[PDB]
Design an enzyme around this catalytic site. Structure first.
Site, PDB file in Angstrom:
ATOM      1  N   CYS A 253      -0.197  -2.012  16.007  1.00 41.52           N
ATOM      2  CA  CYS A 253      -0.505  -3.496  16.518  1.00 41.52           C
ATOM      3  C   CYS A 253      -1.181  -3.556  17.955  1.00 41.52           C
ATOM      4  O   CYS A 253      -1.933  -4.155  18.216  1.00 41.52           O
ATOM      5  CB  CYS A 253       0.761  -4.538  16.283  1.00 41.52           C
ATOM      6  SG  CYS A 253       2.438  -3.917  16.905  1.00 41.52           S
TER       7      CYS A 253
ATOM      8  N   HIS B 159       6.879  -7.696  24.523  1.00 42.07           N
ATOM      9  CA  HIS B 159       6.794  -7.580  22.974  1.00 42.07           C
ATOM     10  C   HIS B 159       7.746  -8.426  22.346  1.00 42.07           C
ATOM     11  O   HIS B 159       9.085  -8.352  22.770  1.00 42.07           O
ATOM     12  CB  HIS B 159       6.806  -6.191  22.551  1.00 42.07           C
ATOM     13  CG  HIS B 159       6.347  -5.942  21.201  1.00 42.07           C
ATOM     14  ND1 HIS B 159       6.817  -6.082  19.788  1.00 42.07           N
ATOM     15  CD2 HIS B 159       4.928  -5.496  20.942  1.00 42.07           C
ATOM     16  CE1 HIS B 159       6.045  -5.925  19.106  1.00 42.07           C
ATOM     17  NE2 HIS B 159       5.051  -5.583  19.557  1.00 42.07           N
TER      18      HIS B 159
HETATM   19  N1  LIG Z   1       6.436  -5.899  12.676  1.00 37.10           N
HETATM   20  C1  LIG Z   1       5.163  -5.710  12.942  1.00 37.10           C
HETATM   21  O1  LIG Z   1       4.902  -6.505  13.823  1.00 37.10           O
HETATM   22  C2  LIG Z   1       4.331  -4.455  12.714  1.00 37.10           C
HETATM   23  C3  LIG Z   1       3.057  -4.422  13.387  1.00 37.10           C
HETATM   24  C4  LIG Z   1       2.415  -3.218  12.766  1.00 37.10           C
HETATM   25  C5  LIG Z   1       2.924  -1.996  11.866  1.00 37.10           C
HETATM   26  N2  LIG Z   1       3.954  -2.317  11.729  1.00 37.10           N
HETATM   27  C6  LIG Z   1       4.673  -1.118  10.674  1.00 37.10           C
HETATM   28  O2  LIG Z   1       4.844  -1.396   9.338  1.00 37.10           O
HETATM   29  C7  LIG Z   1       5.830  -0.575   8.763  1.00 37.10           C
HETATM   30  C8  LIG Z   1       7.313  -1.669   8.254  1.00 37.10           C
HETATM   31  O3  LIG Z   1       7.313  -2.758   9.308  1.00 37.10           O
HETATM   32  P1  LIG Z   1       8.107  -4.144   8.747  1.00 37.10           P
HETATM   33  O4  LIG Z   1       8.141  -5.150   9.924  1.00 37.10           O
HETATM   34  O5  LIG Z   1       7.525  -4.709   7.682  1.00 37.10           O
HETATM   35  O6  LIG Z   1       9.623  -3.651   8.288  1.00 37.10           O
HETATM   36  P2  LIG Z   1      10.596  -4.440   7.175  1.00 37.10           P
HETATM   37  O7  LIG Z   1      12.054  -3.812   7.127  1.00 37.10           O
HETATM   38  O8  LIG Z   1      10.162  -5.787   7.284  1.00 37.10           O
HETATM   39  O9  LIG Z   1       9.837  -3.994   5.791  1.00 37.10           O
HETATM   40  C9  LIG Z   1      10.205  -2.423   5.242  1.00 37.10           C
HETATM   41  C10 LIG Z   1      10.382  -2.896   3.527  1.00 37.10           C
HETATM   42  O10 LIG Z   1      10.410  -1.419   3.166  1.00 37.10           O
HETATM   43  C11 LIG Z   1      11.246  -1.652   1.676  1.00 37.10           C
HETATM   44  N3  LIG Z   1      11.419  -0.191   1.405  1.00 37.10           N
HETATM   45  C12 LIG Z   1      12.440   0.804   2.119  1.00 37.10           C
HETATM   46  N4  LIG Z   1      12.498   1.737   1.691  1.00 37.10           N
HETATM   47  C13 LIG Z   1      11.552   2.084   0.582  1.00 37.10           C
HETATM   48  C14 LIG Z   1      11.411   3.051  -0.502  1.00 37.10           C
HETATM   49  N5  LIG Z   1      11.711   4.181  -0.259  1.00 37.10           N
HETATM   50  N6  LIG Z   1      10.673   2.564  -1.256  1.00 37.10           N
HETATM   51  C15 LIG Z   1       9.850   1.312  -1.465  1.00 37.10           C
HETATM   52  N7  LIG Z   1      10.366   0.477  -0.466  1.00 37.10           N
HETATM   53  C16 LIG Z   1      11.198   0.597   0.649  1.00 37.10           C
HETATM   54  C17 LIG Z   1      12.521  -2.488   2.117  1.00 37.10           C
HETATM   55  O11 LIG Z   1      13.327  -2.900   0.757  1.00 37.10           O
HETATM   56  C18 LIG Z   1      11.835  -3.433   3.274  1.00 37.10           C
HETATM   57  O12 LIG Z   1      11.313  -4.510   2.309  1.00 37.10           O
HETATM   58  C19 LIG Z   1       6.381   0.196   9.983  1.00 37.10           C
HETATM   59  O13 LIG Z   1       5.753   1.548   9.913  1.00 37.10           O
HETATM   60  C20 LIG Z   1       5.976  -0.509  11.230  1.00 37.10           C
HETATM   61  O14 LIG Z   1       5.727   0.369  12.332  1.00 37.10           O
HETATM   62  C21 LIG Z   1       4.849  -3.444  11.936  1.00 37.10           C
END
Ligand SMILES: NC(=O)c1ccc[n+]([C@@H]2O[C@H](COP(=O)([O-])OP(=O)(O)OC[C@H]3O[C@@H](n4cnc5c(N)ncnc54)[C@H](O)[C@@H]3O)[C@@H](O)[C@H]2O)c1
Ligand SMILES: NC(=O)c1ccc[n+]([C@@H]2O[C@H](COP(=O)([O-])OP(=O)(O)OC[C@H]3O[C@@H](n4cnc5c(N)ncnc54)[C@H](O)[C@@H]3O)[C@@H](O)[C@H]2O)c1
Ligand SMILES: NC(=O)c1ccc[n+]([C@@H]2O[C@H](COP(=O)([O-])OP(=O)(O)OC[C@H]3O[C@@H](n4cnc5c(N)ncnc54)[C@H](O)[C@@H]3O)[C@@H](O)[C@H]2O)c1
Ligand SMILES: NC(=O)c1ccc[n+]([C@@H]2O[C@H](COP(=O)([O-])OP(=O)(O)OC[C@H]3O[C@@H](n4cnc5c(N)ncnc54)[C@H](O)[C@@H]3O)[C@@H](O)[C@H]2O)c1
Lengths: 332, 332, 332, 332
Positions: D149, D176
């Site tokens: 991001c 952040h």
């Molecule tokens: N929050 C942000 O602002 C943001 C911005 C850019 C990138 N990201 C990236 O996106 C990714 C996730 O971020 P998030 O904020 O959505 O986390 P999150 O916890 O909100 O979402 C992760 C999801 O993964 C599921 N999960 C876990 N293990 C699994 C498996 N083995 N198989 C299938 N599903 C599974 C969980 O049940 C959960 O719903 C990260 O790599 C993060 O770096 C996040």
């Protein structure tokens, strides 16, 4: 009907948003000595809680222009010095928090206005609540009050329950969001000491007249209810927790049926109903006065129960102000 | 008397702080598979809520040393694979949140410990509350529970009021600070959907067994109390709101006098009393179980009333754990 | 030495706490028109951020008494109408935020006080910072300023670095906790529109003079520094982020060694040093002006670098006020 | 093009919202072992930050139905056991945070999918940013990454500035908002100790690779940038603070013109521009990658400047994922 606004704060601005949303009321003038013409544009455009205004806003020729309608601006401290008549303002909304008695609010009629509506409780002006006693309003009355946010949540609920089962006695608590009379850090608050401690840091107990006032709007319940409040660190949305004893016996499922029927008939738009797993942010910018949460309540037995109902204190109340003025205008 | 700890979390660490301060209880071993030896030093030294530790803390020869006392460290997931006896641990405090039944907590005795104390409610182990039923403890009992933080606040208050006036029926709400089973942003929480929504943003309703449990600790009140909870965005300190009906008539002032007398005699240190204008931060790191707030409550009649009491859910509870183990040891 | 206070706010009260703890400075009078005698007891006893006062506090014969010392109370809006001399107040601390120029602060001498200290920057009174230019003070000066909280953090750090390697140019950002000139919900704030938006909800950009002012306190650096600020939702403790370019080349480890030596010798008590894994709550009620965080900073090259330093903006500043007055008095 | 989703979290759900908003991409399957079919309905309907979904959602015949389109649901821990092919999923979005290398993410192709997109940086898959290097994409590539991001905010800004004036060297800080890898109270966080302290209570320093990664996407700037981060207690929206030295001299007003022209031509939709007095809540649910704030920045002289740009980290990034997949599909 043509309308004026005294006090362009949280309520003053959101009432203005609601009237352009509907089209039953027309806003034609605004008074606030601490907000100049260019500063008004900025405060109406952007909002931390409810979002950007969808529409156009600008300043042209010394007037405020929203979606193309021009509005007259004033800057007076004394309400007797405002020329409402010249601008064409037939009703006035009083929302400064400083002029809540009949003597004080009376000053507006001197500037050439016909009737006044106070956006708060009152020691002596007559109080109304839509859905409950609004039919008692009469065209002899020049000054009236729309009561408090909490009283608009409690009153519709207690009427349904009293009519079908009967209330012997009851006590209320409200868990309530933060407002503009509180403080960022520990400081001076006048005669009420707990109300000046840090708002971001604490749970704070406080007084409320909201439950005794139900007894003015519903005479039969006069002297059978009272309560208190806690203030907590969220920026908008509040909840009511009513504990009461009943006359006729009643299972929980019977209480649910009665409440759903009222929400689908006479009180549609005012009293809602739900069985989903909701929390406070789910009601941000909701237009109802009171929404019953069926999962969160509980009963000790057939005569003793605890009931739970949610309310947007800023945006629900604002829409009830507009409704009141429409009713009134149909009785001219 | 010499003791062990299984689970070095918020309760596990603060119990350890309390024991070094007092000096009748002595800590000799600690088990936590997710916190290694150097990480333990850091977590005990610095604390966001309660402040820096006053004393010395360091690592020497593979052991943790506080003010000069060496402690044995283990790293096991299965509690049966742990060698308590060898280290000299006669009592064990179970504070992981994962082993709360008699079968499961029984595993500690296979490792050579004498008696076990569970830091939470239990489906089948017997519960005790200091000040209320602790004199019913006896030597035959190998596994016991100290109940919940909320039950330690409610129980002492209801025993005084039932003894002097008599409780016919009653209903309870607690407004409670955030804990480690909640979530920073909207997410999965198992069977309880409301519990996983954003903790910094919302008011959240939840269930609680704390009021029914009073009926096991005080048999006479079995079947006459129940209640619920709301979670709000503060990091520590909670409050109880009890609404109840009485047998004998009683003015508010009479209720105040009976409560002050108990606080000054047989419940000193457990139940407090105050008439000052307090808020939540005023009880951070306070050691009582329950403090009556005289100004915040209110009465409708001589038989129908609302009572208000505060509690530090981390640090009050931690000190009751220590007191329980002393009683127990002085009866071996 | 015996002293008076004009303005009993966050700084005014905490200065008073510091002086009773130390015992070289003695407080004998207090003026605040908005806080009456009984309200003063309550505000000094209880504190949301720093905790209860350890000592005795009461009211007797129309005077405020702390650990047995009686203090004279006044209630004037105009500072010329105040009788400092009669009560025996030789120095006055000006901490209202309303009288920061030489004309305006001069009014205290008409009431019979000798010298005045302003707890904020000033357009025309001379500024001092302990550790940096305090030895340039002299007896002819009747009115002086102790500068801002941010300037007391930056100035000591830049003097060490300029002396050893040399600063060609630099730019500063501070991330800062909330204060009493902000607002709980969206509202009016005068000429600075961003400053009135909701403090619990937002990250807010703002202007600061704190970096240019270093050029008055250290003439050699005049015209080579400037900066800005963001306000965020914590109640106390702030941080400085300085990006700068150097004359002589320097590895990161060399910068660390020079900073540790200064902290252990001539700047002991003012500038701290640490290599632990700290966060903001770890400095609540810390008495230093500036603490270097060695792990958090980083270098691109041997001439281009980013440095990080923490400060308690309420309680660090309060203790520097006391130190300044001692120096002054020992030169009369 | 037909699409699948692995990981139904904050990003997984908001990507799904965006695709139904556009109509260039069609979602046909979803995998998450910790969220059952009925629980998915609830989490998609209600949202604490961005509001209720405007549309219809229900469960029929073991499938999830949104606005009338049926979707296939799976519940597997190992990605090699998912039958993407049978359901008709041609591209897969990988958003669990657990599978970010080429080996690990490769498992999806075994289940019968054609190409994979990783929603995070990567140690070895090739990185792209829309507006900057997306034209380098090639149909030989089966596995790719959309970067972080923060990198999507910084990269477009630095390209414009480097092209017109030239960047010699620079250093970055980002302030952040909170995310799901943080904790509600002090606790275990593995190898990164500061990241486990209370999120509602503290300002927390942290590491970031986002600035060095600009050097992969813009080769000329490789080795001339780096930076760090602070985490603060707001639930969404973040900001970048870039301090840099220039080759060619440039007045502040010249920098503004160049940025506005780019926003109106080639980078329309990605890079915005504004002169109003904004704060963080004003960008909640904004679809841009980067918005320049002209009032908040400052210059020391013609070669040394500080620049400021805002970004919705959840909802801006989500819309760039969808755009990337469309581009890709036009090159089949
Ligand atoms: N929050 C942000 O602002 C943001 C911005 C850019 C990138 N990201 C990236 O996106 C990714 C996730 O971020 P998030 O904020 O959505 O986390 P999150 O916890 O909100 O979402 C992760 C999801 O993964 C599921 N999960 C876990 N293990 C699994 C498996 N083995 N198989 C299938 N599903 C599974 C969980 O049940 C959960 O719903 C990260 O790599 C993060 O770096 C996040
Ligand atoms: N916030 C709520 O949820 C809520 C709900 C129901 C009722 N109310 C009531 O509405 C009233 C105001 O509430 P608020 O939240 O909008 O406060 P506010 O501070 O947000 O608004 C008050 C406004 O009054 C203006 N003002 C002050 N003195 C004035 C004068 N002499 N002449 C003209 N304008 C003046 C101020 O400049 C300010 O804009 C109160 O009486 C309150 O009890 C509030
Ligand atoms: N915080 C409160 O208000 C409060 C009050 C009273 C009781 N309690 C109860 O105390 C218990 C612990 O609460 P907490 O607030 O400290 O939670 P916490 O997460 O702070 O502590 C739990 C600890 O257990 C450890 N753990 C997990 N599995 C383990 C294993 N197999 N062996 C050893 N350690 C393991 C974790 O690493 C962690 O350190 C809970 O049952 C809770 O209900 C909490
Ligand atoms: N909090 C900080 O971080 C900090 C740090 C350094 C300096 N300061 C400065 O110190 C000054 C005071 O700050 P504060 O944080 O205590 O604000 P505050 O509002 O907490 O205190 C101001 C006090 O002045 C009183 N007051 C107003 N008019 C008065 C009059 N005519 N006579 C007597 N008293 C009057 C108020 O009742 C109040 O008690 C400001 O100039 C501020 O910039 C603050």
């Amino acid at each position: 009907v043509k309308v004026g606004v005294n006090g362009f704060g949280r309520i003053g601005r959101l009432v203005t948003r609601a009237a352009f949303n509907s089209g039953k009321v027309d806003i034609v003038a605004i008074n606030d000595p601490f907000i100049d013409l260019h500063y008004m544009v900025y405060m109406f455009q952007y909002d931390s809680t409810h979002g950007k205004f969808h529409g156009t806003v600008k300043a042209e020729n010394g007037k405020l222009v929203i979606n193309g309608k021009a509005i007259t601006i004033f800057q007076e401290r004394d309400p007797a010095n405002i020329k409402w008549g010249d601008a064409g303002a037939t009703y006035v909304v009083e929302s400064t928090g400083v002029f809540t008695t009949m003597e004080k609010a009376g000053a507006h009629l001197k500037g050439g206005a016909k009737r006044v509506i106070i956006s708060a409780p009152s020691a002596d002006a007559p109080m109304f609540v839509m859905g409950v006693n609004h039919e008692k309003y009469d065209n002899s009355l020049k000054i009236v009050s729309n009561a408090s946010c909490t009283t608009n949540c409690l009153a519709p609920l207690a009427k349904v329950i009293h009519d079908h089962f009967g209330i012997v006695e009851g006590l209320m608590t409200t868990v309530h969001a933060i407002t503009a009379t509180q403080k960022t850090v520990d400081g001076p608050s006048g005669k009420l000491w707990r109300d000046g401690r840090g708002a971001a840091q604490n749970i704070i107990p406080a007084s409320t007249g909201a439950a005794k006032a139900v007894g003015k709007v519903i005479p039969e319940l006069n002297g059978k209810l009272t309560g208190m409040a806690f203030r907590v660190p969220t920026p908008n949305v509040s909840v009511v927790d009513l504990t009461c004893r009943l006359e006729k016996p009643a299972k929980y499922d019977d209480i649910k049926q009665v409440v759903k029927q009222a929400s689908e008939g006479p009180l549609k738009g005012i009293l809602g109903y739900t069985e989903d797993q909701v929390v406070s942010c789910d009601f941000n910018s909701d237009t109802h006065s009171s929404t019953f949460d069926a999962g969160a309540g509980i009963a000790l037995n057939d005569h003793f129960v605890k009931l739970i109902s949610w309310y947007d204190n800023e945006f629900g109340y604002s829409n009830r102000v507009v409704d009141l003025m429409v009713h009134m205008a149909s009785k001219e």
